[PDB]
Design an enzyme around this catalytic site. Sequence first.
Site, PDB file in Angstrom:
ATOM      1  N   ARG B 255       0.821  -1.199   0.000  1.00 16.36           N
ATOM      2  CA  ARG B 255       0.000   0.000   0.000  1.00 16.36           C
ATOM      3  C   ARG B 255       0.858   1.254   0.000  1.00 16.36           C
ATOM      4  O   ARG B 255       0.548   2.217  -0.703  1.00 16.36           O
ATOM      5  CB  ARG B 255      -0.936  -0.020   1.200  1.00 16.36           C
ATOM      6  N   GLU B 357      -3.422  17.267  14.254  1.00 19.50           N
ATOM      7  CA  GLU B 357      -4.648  17.130  15.031  1.00 19.50           C
ATOM      8  C   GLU B 357      -5.278  18.478  15.350  1.00 19.50           C
ATOM      9  O   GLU B 357      -6.507  18.612  15.335  1.00 19.50           O
ATOM     10  CB  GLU B 357      -4.372  16.363  16.316  1.00 19.50           C
ATOM     11  N   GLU B 384      -9.279  15.249   6.353  1.00 19.39           N
ATOM     12  CA  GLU B 384      -7.896  14.813   6.444  1.00 19.39           C
ATOM     13  C   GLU B 384      -6.977  15.674   5.591  1.00 19.39           C
ATOM     14  O   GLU B 384      -5.813  15.853   5.942  1.00 19.39           O
ATOM     15  CB  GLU B 384      -7.781  13.350   6.052  1.00 19.39           C
ATOM     16  N   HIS B 487      -9.409  -2.668   5.012  1.00 23.33           N
ATOM     17  CA  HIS B 487     -10.551  -1.918   4.525  1.00 23.33           C
ATOM     18  C   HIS B 487     -11.493  -2.759   3.692  1.00 23.33           C
ATOM     19  O   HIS B 487     -12.645  -2.371   3.514  1.00 23.33           O
ATOM     20  CB  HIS B 487     -10.074  -0.725   3.717  1.00 23.33           C
ATOM     21  N   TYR B 497      -9.046   8.031   0.058  1.00 21.67           N
ATOM     22  CA  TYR B 497      -7.606   8.213   0.112  1.00 21.67           C
ATOM     23  C   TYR B 497      -7.048   8.698  -1.207  1.00 21.67           C
ATOM     24  O   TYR B 497      -5.953   9.263  -1.229  1.00 21.67           O
ATOM     25  CB  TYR B 497      -6.927   6.914   0.516  1.00 21.67           C
TER      26      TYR B 497
HETATM   27 ZN    ZN Z   1      -6.204  13.218  10.593  1.00 22.30          ZN
END
Ligand code: ZN
EC number: 3.4.17.23
Lengths: 198, 557
Positions: B255, B357, B384, B487, B497
């Site tokens: 991956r 974060e 994200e 997944h 993604y």
């Molecule tokens: Zn994150």
Amino acid sequence: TNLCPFDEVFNATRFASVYAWNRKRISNCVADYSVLYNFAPFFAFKCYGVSPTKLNDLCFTNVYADSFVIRGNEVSQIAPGQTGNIADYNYKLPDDFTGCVIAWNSNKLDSKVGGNYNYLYRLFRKSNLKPFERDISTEIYQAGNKPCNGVAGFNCYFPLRSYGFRPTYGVGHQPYRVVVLSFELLHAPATVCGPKKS
Amino acid sequence: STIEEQAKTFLDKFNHEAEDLFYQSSLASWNYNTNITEENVQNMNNAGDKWSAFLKEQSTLAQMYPLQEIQNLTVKLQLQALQQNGSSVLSEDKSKRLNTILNTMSTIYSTGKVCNPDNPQECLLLEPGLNEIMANSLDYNERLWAWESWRSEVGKQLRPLYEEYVVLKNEMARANHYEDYGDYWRGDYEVNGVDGYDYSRGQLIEDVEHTFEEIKPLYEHLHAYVRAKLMNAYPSYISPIGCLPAHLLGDMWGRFWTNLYSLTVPFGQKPNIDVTDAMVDQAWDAQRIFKEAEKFFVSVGLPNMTQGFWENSMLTDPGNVQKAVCHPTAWDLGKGDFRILMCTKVTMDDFLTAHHEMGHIQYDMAYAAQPFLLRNGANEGFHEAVGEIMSLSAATPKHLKSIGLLSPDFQEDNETEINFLLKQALTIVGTLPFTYMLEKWRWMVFKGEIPKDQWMKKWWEMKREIVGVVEPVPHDETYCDPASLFHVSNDYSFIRYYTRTLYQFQFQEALCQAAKHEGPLHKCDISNSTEAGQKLFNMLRLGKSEPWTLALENVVG
Ligand SMILES: [Zn+2]
Ligand SMILES: *[C@@H]1O[C@H](CO)[C@@H](O[C@@H]2O[C@H](CO)[C@@H](O)[C@H](O)[C@H]2NC(C)=O)[C@H](O)[C@H]1NC(C)=O
Ligand SMILES: *[C@@H]1O[C@H](CO)[C@@H](O[C@@H]2O[C@H](CO)[C@@H](O)[C@H](O)[C@H]2NC(C)=O)[C@H](O)[C@H]1NC(C)=O
Ligand SMILES: *[C@@H]1O[C@H](CO)[C@@H](O[C@@H]2O[C@H](CO)[C@@H](O)[C@H](O)[C@H]2NC(C)=O)[C@H](O)[C@H]1NC(C)=O
Ligand SMILES: *[C@@H]1O[C@H](CO)[C@@H](O[C@@H]2O[C@H](CO)[C@@H](O)[C@H](O)[C@H]2NC(C)=O)[C@H](O)[C@H]1NC(C)=O
Ligand SMILES: *[C@@H]1O[C@H](CO)[C@@H](O[C@@H]2O[C@H](CO)[C@@H](O)[C@H](O)[C@H]2NC(C)=O)[C@H](O)[C@H]1NC(C)=O
Ligand SMILES: *[C@@H]1O[C@H](CO)[C@@H](O[C@@H]2O[C@H](CO)[C@@H](O)[C@H](O)[C@H]2NC(C)=O)[C@H](O)[C@H]1NC(C)=O
Ligand SMILES: *[C@@H]1O[C@H](CO)[C@@H](O)[C@H](O)[C@H]1NC(C)=O
């Protein structure tokens, strides 16, 4: 000389909800505004009719102190010419307001871990409130066109809800105690007002 | 009072009650996660089941307002989010069977074991021990053993379960007018009725395939370079004109190629920037990291932390016995309660994870004024991406030397820049063909274009053709190699993604120009520029109020 009993409407160990706000009328006495103005940070202290400085040379017939508790971000609605769930269904101020407002934070007092469901507010109503109107009815608000016969359900809801106050909230979701003073001068020659230095 | 004002009155009551119940459930879950006990488990489960039941009740109640006569797009958005049946369109037998096979697949993946052929009492799980061989080892035979045995001993148990999972999910999807489960998944990017910003569910495939066509010239050169560098670690095993064996790539699936850095570093004698010892020598603690992060975020014009963030957050590992899941996350409990859960050490990677974060926390603080249902990213890839651009900007030498963690002179060189860019491309670029190919296979399988007696044939054909890797051992139709990834067997969509990786860079390029950057893009630092903060805040505060194509335009153009 009998001073104004401001020490009770400010130190009330239990305040009133906003849908049922407390109102105390102060009779002919001497009014000490210097006990509250020197007192505390007072997160909100907005005066419209008179200037906040000269409360000690003007006089008025009788004064009302209205007391309640609301959320943090609703204090902006306590002002002449405002709209919102509080300025429409719970407490209204007329545009020709002559008194003023003050509010402060009470997170350490009126909030408890697990929820303080003893503070209510109305969010459903048929029409807007009138200035200084108080409504305590608990009739089941009907939203649709079908009568609901005094039971909860589809298109008919209970009109009152609760602030689930907790200490782990953000400023704006925390309890705030609000006291609004309201002045009045109808025809009285000699009334209650401030003290002079002798 | 026709049909629309009733919907608004219903939504007000829903907002209030759901906000309260969600706060309760989230507080319970936080209490459990930061302090693992037994009582906390059921304490959180009670609130969780209460919330789920309330949601199901309100969902069924909300069907009584048809979607056709609502004119307000906000009200229509909320009602459409609340009306979706999801599951529970199936029977009771069918729904129970579906949940059973989901749990079975998850448990097979989580507790599957393989063991040595010469000492059968030495069985290894996947997490602590198989993907350590796959990440660290340099033995061709051991890597081949691990790769083959994981798919042969655990992959073969998931085939008869996946074949049934496909059918049940397709039924659940077609009963909601969707044509398959793949279209149900693609339904996250769909926009209807905005007249300029519409987006169909079948256009996503076209956009993905048209954007992938421009990455092939770069992935081909990276592939060729990595093949040439691997022909020195495994001589006589790679062919200089063929694909790459699938077990030599850095982890169990391939991956990310990020573990081939030690083999393929361009200039191995120039260590790249690592301000770790300069942090301990300056007496840096877990609070200084977050203070610096907050200062960086205020630099661009974003607000401070909420002052409840400093009291309720768990920024350090609780020492004696307060066992907590040390996984860094940002919590949005509601009603103005934002927190961060991470067990920070004093390193460089935690210095970047702090920024990542707090990016999430700033996104959450931005749209906290929206109705409860419209508090999320514009789609599944926005959150994200907004998180990642912060760590991108905060790890440049220009920022590190302005904080004080680098020497005030620190002349940089182009060899270190190439080192850095290759370390980045082994992770960002090496995973786009994999993501695209996997989700394409799953789309074609849900659609029916691959009959269930040609699953592995097409899997390895598309692997040889699109990705460029070849299997070291032939695999017939008794295997299920896709289902041996987290997944795939745990029912998660995978295109988030691919799109995020794109959005991220777009955002950065739009924020570098607003800050008037000059040099190459990979040297940008958006700090001390409020115009970038404004361009970002104009999109952060929308939530899902506007279609994602509009929110994207508010930044990129
Ligand atoms: Zn994150
Ligand atoms: C509001 O009530 C509190 C508590 O009744 C008062 O606090 C008192 O303060 C005086 C002087 O500092 C102390 O002698 C008392 O012991 C306090 N009370 C208690 C119960 O400890 C406070 O003064 C009151 N505010 C006003 C303006 O009168
Ligand atoms: C972590 O959770 C445990 C179990 O809920 C807590 O342990 C007890 O919690 C009760 C709650 O009031 C206390 O009265 C006891 O004194 C606690 N006993 C022990 C041995 O801890 C524990 O307090 C929680 N930890 C934190 C930091 O809150
Ligand atoms: C119905 O749509 C109108 C506009 O199409 C919304 O009006 C907005 O209301 C918010 C606050 O309620 C204001 O901040 C906006 O400025 C208003 N927009 C316009 C263009 O006037 C209205 O809110 C929608 N209904 C609901 C329940 O949200
Ligand atoms: C959600 O599922 C229900 C069945 O569980 C679907 O069926 C409709 O349900 C409503 C509410 O009871 C009835 O009034 C209709 O008569 C049902 N049949 C229809 C609409 O053909 C419902 O359609 C589903 N909703 C969505 C949006 O998929
Ligand atoms: C890094 O920069 C240096 C300096 O510009 C490069 O060194 C020159 O490279 C060119 C191109 O091959 C040669 O013509 C020069 O003779 C080199 N200079 C010297 C002093 O030898 C170097 O090639 C660059 N490296 C990378 C990887 O970009
Ligand atoms: C952002 O701007 C501030 C203000 O100019 C910078 O802080 C100053 O940086 C200079 C250059 O090293 C120092 O001489 C001053 O002492 C700093 N002052 C303060 C109050 O910090 C800051 O370095 C800039 N940050 C970035 C990343 O460019
Ligand atoms: C943030 O907090 C600091 C105190 O730590 C204060 O000096 C600064 O003015 C604050 N800025 C904003 C925007 O709140």
